[PDB]
């Protein structure tokens, strides 16, 4: 099993940024899949979490600007960035949500830097 | 907890012209929306309920249409009366009913 | 709607000791959300254990965590150069909360 | 895959106690129902009694209830059913089978049978 | 003619787990809604699309009784237009309910010391429940692309998971005995009227 | 002709009380259904209360347990009894006269409402 | 309550049809009749639940047919090793959990 993340880059402030999160022996569209990420300096940070059936949902610091989208064809999870911010920056990790035993497949995340 | 979102927030218009204000909901609420007017000090008034039926005893000129989480209320041609801010609620939700956050009709 | 406080901050210990990190919650919460994590440097987090006691899968039998209710503990029974790292409790409300992280060091 | 294996049994003298232990693997032996199907020689199959995942909600049969007792332990995965006041009909060989169903809307189908046990009642 | 049977749905002495959720019928009897009311128990009345001070005048064909046990702190999924763990794999109302929904408190009814392990909900599924269905099932549910027979290992995981109600636990974590009268009206004539 | 004189208001200690009324004319009054509409600078229109024709009150998440309504067939007042007041519940109050339409509910006739102040 | 099975003794060469009957009042609940295989000597397992399906590790020559009060299991060419004693159980509800009776089958 493993977890690829694509997209990071740099982005000027107020701009849009695409990531992705490509999966290969678990399936993108059947799990709960969740965006946690790492500011540096600081833990952990809950992002967004979408259920198996298509529910979303978010973290209050970032309601309205995110969206997370997914695509069965490709099995791979996305993320949308509107309206970034400069405290956005750190680094994204996708994972895999199983509630009662927790998430046990990461990847190893995709850095995104704005300034 | 049923949000209610009203806009625009002003909307001024010459004597005889066309008002319109537009209610929106949180969620799809159907058809359960009552609206009403708020003289400046004075007590509010109930104009049309369900969005479609007019109240016993109001002018003509005002009129009703939307559904889903979409109303609009259509006056024809505004009177130096119809200044007042005006509020949608809905009915929808039971017992606690949760008003608008209200437009202010100004006259130019 | 869910604060986790692990004291504290920081533990410095030597290697072959038994440690003793906490997670405290605000509220009472049920044990059955309760999973803790591994992070060494540069590195994705790793499962430890999930619930209060049981051990995840392929995790070594060094760390046995313990409690219910609000206070809650992990223990290591035998530190081993590879046990030096950041570890985080992780609950479960309506949305995953994460604590401020605890890491272990050296003497 | 599900393990199902069955200890104790023998020749006792009627009048006296006996208890058996189905010890189980596989699965994870707190969310799924347990049985017990003896059968007498070339005569044919009959249930006994049933455990819920709690240990509380036992469903004996109607020729057994009186001195039987189903017990379940969730800290050590092993399935019980102590014998009392043995008659000579009781002589039989003892299955410990799981429940595939939700226990709530429906209950009974067996989907894993272990093995069996033969218990002897003379002197 | 007799009073409707809201005397033993309100007071049964076992509750049904959220998953295989009882249902009742209830016809052609003169209703009596006093029970609900002066009650100063009940934690939660909210009616939809019916006023609850104007039960006593309205004609209903078929009223329809549902009864749970649910965590205290996600009662407010019981609503049309939510979204949750229970609202898309457990229960379901459509966005045109017409009914009354009630929950109160079973601190101590259901609950005992070392933990009630008795209800249990549904914990994994592929899409969305449809409204008014109840799906039960005891397949395992396949996580990834390899299919699973029967096994329980890495990516095979049970569909039902139970709950860790105890006598010492928060208010929001508490378990809940909430009860959904789906004042449904039909195209057919109606039979039953007030 | 329906009026709604509601008296009653003034200022009041914090955590004090009051027993403010809503007297009506021009109609039967056990028939009909009672609410309280306040409305406030910040949040503007409000349901606080109600009470129904067979003894049933229904109250705000923040409302319950605090104020309580009441009726009097007799003499024709409406009453809201507060208890435990706090700071931020400065407001003018309305009682409103519930009418029906089939499923739907709305307010007919409003009254005119008195000043609240916590000092 | 009772479940009955006629012919408790079928004369079948190899391969070729083979059919088999678990008829009994007091239909069934919903679907709720069982199958079970008894090889001699061993512990019986399951081939067909709910009257028309297939368990973990049946093959596909094993079908089941049936609704109501007379329900119907259905084998094709006979592998030699499908000739034993099969048993058919009501399920679903209450303390009535029952047992038919044997229904081995012949060689020649
Ligand atoms: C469930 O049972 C309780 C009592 O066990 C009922 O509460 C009683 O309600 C009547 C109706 O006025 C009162 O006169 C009694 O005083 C109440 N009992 C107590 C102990 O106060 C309750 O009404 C029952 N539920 C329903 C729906 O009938």
């Given at each position: ?115 | ?108 | ?107 | ?123 | ?194 | ?70 009726r009097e067939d007799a003499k024709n007042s409406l009453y809201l009894q507060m208890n435990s007041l706090r700071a931020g519940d400065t407001a003018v109050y309305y009682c409103a006269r519930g009418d029906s339409s089939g499923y739907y509910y709305y307010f007919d006739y409003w009254g005119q409402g008195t000043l609240l102040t916590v000092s």
């Amino acid at each position: 099993v493993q977890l690829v993340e694509s997209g990071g880059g740099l982005v000027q402030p107020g701009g849009s940024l695409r990531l992705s999160c490509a999966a290969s022996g678990i399936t993108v569209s059947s799990n709960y899949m969740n965006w946690v990420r790492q500011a540096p300096g600081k833990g952990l940070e809950w992002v967004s979490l979408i259920y198996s059936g298509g529910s979303t949902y978010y973290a209050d610091s970032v309601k309205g600007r995110f969206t997370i989208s997914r695509d069965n064809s490709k099995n791979t999870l996305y993320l949308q960035m509107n309206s970034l911010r400069a405290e956005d920056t750190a680094v994204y990790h996708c994972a895999r949500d199983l509630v009662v035993y927790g998430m046990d497949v990461w990847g190893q995340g995709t850095t995104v830097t704005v300034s | 907890d049923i949000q209610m979102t009203q806009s625009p927030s002003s909307l001024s218009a010459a004597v005889g012209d066309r008002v319109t204000i537009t209610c929106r909901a949180s969620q799809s609420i159907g058809s359960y929306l009552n609206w009403y007017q708020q003289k400046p000090g004075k007590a509010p008034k109930l104009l049309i309920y369900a969005a479609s039926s007019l109240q016993s005893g109001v002018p003509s000129r005002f009129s009703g249409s939307g559904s889903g989480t979409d109303f609009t209320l259509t006056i024809s041609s505004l009177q130096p009366e119809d200044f007042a801010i005006y509020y949608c609620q809905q009915s929808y939700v039971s017992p606690t009913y949760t008003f608008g956050p209200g437009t202010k009709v100004d006259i130019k | 709607e869910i604060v986790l406080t692990q004291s504290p901050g920081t533990l410095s210990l030597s290697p072959g000791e038994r440690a003793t990190l906490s997670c405290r919650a605000s509220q009472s919460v049920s044990s059955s959300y309760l999973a803790w994590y591994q992070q060494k440097p540069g590195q994705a987090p790793r499962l430890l254990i999930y619930g209060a006691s049981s051990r995840a899968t392929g995790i070594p039998d060094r760390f046995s965590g313990s409690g219910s209710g609000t206070d809650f503990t992990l223990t290591i029974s035998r530190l081993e150069p590879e046990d030096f790292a950041v570890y985080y409790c992780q609950q479960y409300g309506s949305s995953p909360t994460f604590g401020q992280g605890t890491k272990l060091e050296i003497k | 895959q599900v393990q199902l294996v069955e200890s104790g049994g023998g020749v006792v003298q009627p009048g006296r106690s006996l208890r058996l232990s189905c010890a189980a693997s596989g699965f994870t032996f707190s969310s799924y129902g347990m049985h017990w199907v003896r059968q007498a020689p070339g005569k044919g199959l009959e249930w006994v009694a049933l455990i819920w995942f709690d240990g509380s909600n036992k469903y004996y049969a109607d020729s057994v209830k009186g001195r039987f007792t189903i017990s379940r332990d969730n800290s050590k995965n092993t399935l019980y059913l102590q014998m009392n006041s043995l008659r000579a009909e009781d002589t039989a060989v003892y299955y410990c089978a799981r429940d595939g169903l939700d226990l709530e809307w429906l209950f009974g189908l067996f989907d894993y049978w272990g093995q069996g046990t033969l218990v002897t009642v003379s002197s | 003619t007799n009073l409707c049977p809201f005397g033993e749905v309100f007071n049964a002495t076992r509750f049904a787990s959220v998953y295989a959720w009882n249902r009742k019928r209830i016809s052609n009897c003169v209703a009596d809604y006093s029970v609900l009311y002066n009650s100063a128990s009940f934690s939660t009345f909210k009616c939809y699309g019916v006023s609850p001070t104007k039960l006593n005048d309205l004609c209903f064909t078929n009223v329809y009784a549902d009864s749970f046990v649910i965590r205290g702190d996600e009662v407010r999924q019981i609503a049309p237009g939510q979204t949750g763990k229970i609202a898309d794999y457990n229960y379901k109302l459509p966005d045109d309910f017409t009914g009354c929904v009630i929950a109160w408190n079973s601190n101590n009814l259901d609950s005992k010391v070392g933990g009630n392990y008795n209800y249990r909900y549904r914990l994994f599924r592929k899409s969305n429940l449809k409204p008014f269905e109840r799906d039960i099932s005891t397949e395992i549910y396949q996580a990834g692309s390899k299919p699973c027979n029967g096994v329980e290992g890495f990516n095979c995981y049970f569909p039902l998971q139970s709950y860790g109600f105890q006598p010492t636990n928060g208010v929001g974590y508490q378990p809940y005995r909430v009860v959904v009268l789906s004042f449904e009206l039909l195209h057919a004539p109606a039979t039953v009227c007030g | 002709e329906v009026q709604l004189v509601e008296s009653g208001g003034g200022l009041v200690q914090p955590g004090g009380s009051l027993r403010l009324s809503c007297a009506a004319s021009g109609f039967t009054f056990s028939s009909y259904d009672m609410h309280w509409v306040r409305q406030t600078t910040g949040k503007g229109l409000e349901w606080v209360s109600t009470i129904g024709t067979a003894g049933d009150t229904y109250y705000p998440d923040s409302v319950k347990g605090r104020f309580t309504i009441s009726r009097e067939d007799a003499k024709n007042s409406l009453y809201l009894q507060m208890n435990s007041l706090r700071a931020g519940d400065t407001a003018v109050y309305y009682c409103a006269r519930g009418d029906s339409s089939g499923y739907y509910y709305y307010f007919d006739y409003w009254g005119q409402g008195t000043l609240l102040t916590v000092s």
